[PDB]
Design a protein around this ligand. Structure first.
Ligand code: 3PE
Ligand code: 3PE
Ligand code: 3PE
Ligand code: 3PE
Ligand code: DCQ
Ligand code: LFA
Ligand code: LFA
Ligand code: SF4
Lengths: 60, 149, 162, 322, 131, 213
């Protein structure tokens, strides 16, 4: 390899190390299940239920 | 939106950076989607729209009849052959559908791009190191559900 | 000091005897490693610290190359072990056994008559070896560089494919 | 048995035992520390539930590793298979035995010193070689061949990268090496020796980006595939002890060792060693893995001439100032 | 003296306790816990399907020439190791000797690089075809 | 309230799994129980999953490995590529008929102790793929410790199953050594999660309407 390629590669390695080391100062992105509950949007498709009418009888 | 193209050589690096540019172009399309979102129906006014709009199903009898038959026996597609080709995430994905006039497909042929890329693999990697093949597998953009259907 | 010398020499003798009469090549290389470590311990017991350090340093690399070549060629399971074991017979070793024994007897008889005041084991430093090496032995250093160059050229010319 | 000589002998023995126990504990707790620091570098937490802050995660891992089935395969060379983790555990521990962690705190004040470190590294390659060969696994044999290729890459210039520091100190002894850095640390004059020793010492421990014998993406963890239980744990505890030893040697040779203006000498030594341990973790987190033919080309065409020219320039400077 | 023999005893105890701790951890791993039994447990791992052949084969390494060259270059390195510990005593004459030695070393390295002795990459992995 | 499993790979039983299970009582004294609890604590707090995936469910499991979920917090991120170093097999994906001998071989190559989580509807029962080329559930031949419904289960569902496996491990009885003692594996017959959560689930009255975000 050329000398310029060696110096450029050294610089890019230094830059990669520097940016990950700066990620060490960043805010955490973790959503801490189960201590903080998972937010689910209202139409999220999970457990199936059978519901009742406003009069209290089963709708099915 | 722009379609990024390479310089003539399909490299691992060139494929990855082309997908990076495609990501930026999809961000542009999403910006246009956010800013210019039409007001109107989310379902077509066709009788074969499956299922019909739910509020009309819940209060109108003919809509309820259409919904009842569409979800149970199925919508009746008149006998024909249809094809749609799209730019999927990993290449060109296509559906070729044959209706025999029933509520089921007579033939559903799915063309997926990963099948072709995995068949291309031995021609493009022959005579290389194993590490080159690892990088090649990482740069193809395939999943095996696409390959085997 | 004498404890280390005698035990390391005994280990070197036993490991070398294990090397020359072994069938598995990787096991033979491990016993060669053990014998050279023991000879380095002998060197350390005599005050030749630089020689012992270089004994471990350059034979760890050299036997690594021997392992590379053994993996390239010799290791096949039990095929090379069966072939090598069939090559060793009682007659095949008993022939040169008395030859080596009488050579050792004559050399030992010549050794036992020499004047010996004992090796006090005073350490001869690596600095003193470096001073002698680049002092009175300058031509030895430069012509040894030429010797290693010749080894490089011979290895390149012979050990190629096409 | 009341004599000053004998009690000084047991004091030195106790100090050596304390050094050994602290180094082994630092290897295990730095397996845990690698997990936590990788979490820190990747905007997450790592193990922080088992005990306070995850401090009992190492204990749980040790219990799991002990009570895991520690097996020896029927297709493997059993003695060599068992011997390879022992080499991986012991070689760079013995290399640590020459590190002066404080004035008066060194296990072995050897006249050969850094030569003993080179001896232990040259012995340390055989752990991966024996593990790859003896396990009778195809991926493990490929890992062993890659490890030998790596050794060809770095061992040609590792000692030569240390030779500028040796030349400046005029001695192989490591206490003399830290005494020669009383005014200026060796990272300033021996900067090219420093970067070449950093490359070669990362390659000594088979740490990323030089983890080609154990390359997960290529060889599915390579040479230690058939290992399990405490033999696998022996391989990784030896790897972390090797990280500790290489970081401490880097501090000792290029960063003054224990010398510093205000703090106690062991505090300076521990701070600098902890910094380079963190740098091991950070380069594992930061940069990609080169191909091993590219690593061999880099070692033979760049690093080795750099070490030779560095030694020549260092000697010219030393003789000019003498 | 006394510090020297204290350090000798410390080195001996260091090595003994290190090897004994390794052996103790190996023994504790061996004896604790249960054991698994399976029909294909004692089959080498090759991603879940049987092997074609085994790992005992004539696997041709490509860097064997570099291995020979490594042995030679390590001996040259020890010559420089001997020089570097006594540079001030050898003076400028020793510097001239080591400069000639290092130049012959570097000329041999340049010769090896230029004749392709250090190249073993297959032609499809030389990365010639780029954009 | 314990099921005892004894394996017999060379016995007079051809159908997988090569084991026998019997409902027994808890075999558990003041020190053996404490040390068994310590072993269970260490095993449940250090669960190394096998890097093994069949389909989309694997994508959700490795999503749980990343920074936004950080399954490392539970000590289960180590993700071994070798079956010898892995403790947990997650069948994360469809048990394809062609892949079933491979799954059996990989399960055989794992060492004691080993646990199995069937992740997703395909691994649970075949899911939506009642089709010629798919085994209808990995528990047709692999003993399964935890089942996760979902297609795919979200990453926190995989984490919930990891906690369920932790509670099951924390009260199981395993041989402390292979030289002396009972070698069979005792697994506690837990109360079903459905019956445990029935009281709080049926009491739900109103949910948010699906019209807003
Ligand atoms: C206490 C010990 C631990 C200390 C921790 C801190 C230091 C860590 C050191 C990490 C060292 C990593 C070295 C990696 C070397 C990789 C060289 C290589 O093989 O690069 C390959 C690449 C392309 O290869 P090429 O030959 O061009 O292609 C031929 C294709 N057949 O070639 C290139 O990309 C060309 C450029 C190569 C650049 C090499 C790396 C430069 C030095 C390391 C990074 C900087 C570390 C900090 C240094 C001090 C900064 C003050
Ligand atoms: C601490 C000391 C750090 C010294 C180096 C700082 C590097 C800064 C950096 O991040 O450089 C990245 C840059 C990448 O270059 P490129 O992708 O072409 O982008 C040009 C626009 N930045 O890289 C460059 O532009 C390359 C220029 C920097 C070269 C540094 C050379 C240092 C001295 C030689 C070391 C190499 C020894 C190898 C053995
Ligand atoms: C069986 C296991 C291996 C046993 C052999 C190696 C250890 C032998 C016992 C050494 C105990 C220490 C000892 O005797 O030290 C004396 C001497 C120290 O040097 P000196 O300063 O002269 O001491 C006298 C005081 N003035 O010591 C020396 O000069 C030599 C130091 C010991 C030899 C170096 C290590 C040899 C390793 C052999 C490995 C064999 C394969 C495994
Ligand atoms: C079983 C082992 C028993 C202990 C072996 C002896 C340990 C002490 C020792 O090796 O001392 C000998 C020598 C002392 O050298 P030094 O202290 O610098 O000088 C004193 C006078 N000039 O120091 C040396 O010779 C140091 C080099 C030999 C150390 C070998 C250690 C084992 C290496 C192989 C491991 C596998
Ligand atoms: C005294 C015995 C203690 C044994 C403790 C062994 C712990 C090993 C963990 C090392 C490790 C492994 C294997 C590992 O595979 C890994 O993933 C790449 C890590 O980083 C997240 C690790 O830290
Ligand atoms: C197929 C060819 C094999 C060649 C093997 C050669 C082995 C030679 C062994 C010689 C043993 C000599 C034993 C001592 C003889 C008496 C002393 C020397 C002659 C006076
Ligand atoms: C991360 C640092 C790792 C260091 C490993 C080696 C440490 C060995 C144990 C040293 C214990 C004694 C320290 C010096 C005592 C005298 C000074 C006390 C005040 C700092
Ligand atoms: S259960 Fe659903 S998400 Fe999971 S593997 Fe099957 S199809 Fe994919």
């Amino acid at each position: 390899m050329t000398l310029k390629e060696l110096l450029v590669g050294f610089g890019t390695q230094v830059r990669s190390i520097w940016m990950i080391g700066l990620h060490a100062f960043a805010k955490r992105e973790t959503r801490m299940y189960p201590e903080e509950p998972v937010y689910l949007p209202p139409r999220y498709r999970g457990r199936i239920v059978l519901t009742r009418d406003p009069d209290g009888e089963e709708r099915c | 939106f722009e379609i990024p193209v390479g310089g003539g050589v399909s490299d691992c690096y060139t494929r990855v950076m082309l997908k990076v540019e495609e990501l930026r172009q999809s961000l542009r399309i999403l910006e246009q989607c956010l800013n210019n979102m039409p007001e109107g129906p989310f379902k077509a006014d066709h009788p074969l729209t499956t299922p019909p709009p739910k509020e009309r199903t819940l209060q109108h009898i003919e809509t309820l009849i259409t919904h009842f038959l569409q979800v149970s026996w199925g919508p009746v597609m008149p006998a024909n052959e249809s094809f749609q080709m799209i730019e999927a995430t990993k290449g060109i994905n296509s559906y070729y559908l044959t209706s025999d006039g029933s509520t089921m497909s007579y033939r559903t042929r799915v063309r997926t791009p990963s099948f072709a890329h995995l068949q291309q693999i031995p021609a493009a990697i022959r005579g290389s190191l194993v590490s080159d093949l690892i990088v090649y597998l990482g740069s193809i953009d395939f999943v095996m559900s696409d390959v085997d259907r | 000091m004498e404890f280390a010398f005698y035990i390391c020499g005994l280990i070197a003798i036993l490991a070398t005897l294990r090397v020359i009469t072994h069938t598995n090549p990787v096991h033979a290389l491990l016993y060669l490693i053990i014998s050279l470590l023991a000879i380095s311990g002998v060197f350390f017991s005599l005050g030749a610290y630089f020689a012992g350090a270089l004994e471990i340093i350059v034979y760890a690399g050299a036997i690594m190359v021997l392992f590379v070549f053994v993996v390239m060629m010799l290791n096949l399971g039990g095929s090379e072990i069966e072939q090598e074991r069939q090559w060793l017979k009682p007659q095949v070793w008993i022939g040169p056994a008395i030859l080596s024994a009488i050579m050792l007897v004559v050399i030992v008889y010549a050794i036992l008559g020499v004047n010996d005041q004992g090796i006090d084991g005073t350490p001869i430093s690596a600095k003193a070896v470096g001073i002698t090496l680049f002092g009175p032995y300058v031509l030895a250093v430069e012509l040894a560089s030429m010797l290693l160059l010749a080894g490089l050229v011979v290895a390149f010319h012979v050990g190629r494919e096409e | 048995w009341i004599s000053p000589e004998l009690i000084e002998i047991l004091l030195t023995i106790l100090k050596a035992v304390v050094i050994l126990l602290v180094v082994v504990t630092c290897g295990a707790f730095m397996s845990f520390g690698e997990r936590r620091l990788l979490g820190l570098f990747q905007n997450r937490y790592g193990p922080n539930r088992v005990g306070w802050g995850g401090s009992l995660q190492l204990v749980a891992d040790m219990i799991k590793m002990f009570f895991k089935e520690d097996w020896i395969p029927k297709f493997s060379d059993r003695v060599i298979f068992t011997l390879a983790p022992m080499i991986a555990f012991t070689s760079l521990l013995l290399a640590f035995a020459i590190v002066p962690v404080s004035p008066g705190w060194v296990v072995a004040d050897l006249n050969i010193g850094i030569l003993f470190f080179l001896m232990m590294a040259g012995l340390a390659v055989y752990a991966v070689l024996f593990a790859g060969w003896s396990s009778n696994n195809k991926y493990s044999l490929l890992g062993a061949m890659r490890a030998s290729a790596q050794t060809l890459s770095y061992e040609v210039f590792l000692g030569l990268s240390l030779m500028g520091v040796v030349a400046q100190a005029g001695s192989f002894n490591m206490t003399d090496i830290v005494n020669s850095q009383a005014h200026v640390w060796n990272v300033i004059p021996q900067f090219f020796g420093f970067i070449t020793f950093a490359i070669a010492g990362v390659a000594v421990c088979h740490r990323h980006p030089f983890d080609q014998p154990e390359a997960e993406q290529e060889l599915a963890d390579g040479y230690h595939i058939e290992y399990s239980g405490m033999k696998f744990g022996l391989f990784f505890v030896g790897e972390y002890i090797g990280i500790v030893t290489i970081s401490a040697l880097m501090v000792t040779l290029f960063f003054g060792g224990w010398q510093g203006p205000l703090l106690p000498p062991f505090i300076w030594f521990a701070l600098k060693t902890a910094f380079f341990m963190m740098m091991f973790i950070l380069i594992r987190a930061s940069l990609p893995r080169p191909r091993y033919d590219q690593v061999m080309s880099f070692g033979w065409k760049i690093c080795l001439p750099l070490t030779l020219i560095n030694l020549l320039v260092t000697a010219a400077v030393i003789l000019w100032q003498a | 003296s006394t510090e020297v023999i204290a350090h000798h005893w410390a080195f001996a105890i260091f090595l003994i306790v290190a090897i004994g701790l390794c052996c103790l951890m190996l023994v504790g791993g061996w004896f604790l816990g249960g054991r698994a039994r399976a029909r294909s447990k004692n089959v080498p791992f090759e991603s879940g399907i049987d092997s074609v052949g085994s790992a005992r084969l004539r696997l041709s390494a490509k860097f064997y020439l570099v291995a020979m060259f490594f042995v030679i270059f390590d001996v040259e390195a020890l010559y420089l190791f001997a020089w570097s510990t006594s540079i001030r005593e050898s003076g400028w004459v020793g510097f001239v000797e080591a400069a000639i030695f290092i130049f012959v070393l570097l000329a041999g390295l340049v010769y090896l690089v230029r004749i392709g002795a250090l190249d073993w990459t297959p032609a499809r992995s030389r990365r010639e075809r780029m954009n | 309230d314990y099921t005892l499993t004894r394996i017999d790979p060379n016995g007079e039983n051809d159908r997988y799994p090569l084991q026998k299970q019997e409902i027994v009582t808890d075999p558990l004294n003041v020190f053996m129980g404490k040390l068994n609890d310590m072993v269970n604590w260490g095993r449940k707090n250090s669960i190394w999953p096998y890097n093994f995936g069949l389909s989309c469910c694997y994508v959700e499991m490795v999503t749980s490995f990343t920074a936004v979920h950080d399954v490392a917090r539970f000590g289960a991120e180590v993700l071994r590529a070798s079956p010898r170093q892995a403790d947990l097999m997650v069948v994360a994906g469809t048990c394809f008929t062609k892949m079933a001998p491979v799954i059996q071989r990989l399960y055989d190559q794992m060492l004691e102790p080993k646990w199995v989580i069937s992740m997703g509807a395909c691994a649970n029962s075949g899911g939506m793929y009642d089709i010629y080329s798919v085994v209808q559930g990995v528990d047709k031949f692999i003993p399964v410790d935890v089942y996760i419904p979902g297609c795919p289960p979200r990453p926190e569902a995989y984490m919930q199953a990891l906690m369920l496996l932790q509670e099951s491990i924390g009260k199981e009885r395993r041989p402390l050594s292979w030289v002396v003692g009972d070698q069979g594996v005792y697994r506690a017959n837990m109360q079903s999660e459905r019956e445990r959560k029935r009281g709080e689930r049926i009491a739900v009255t109103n949910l948010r309407t699906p019209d807003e975000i």
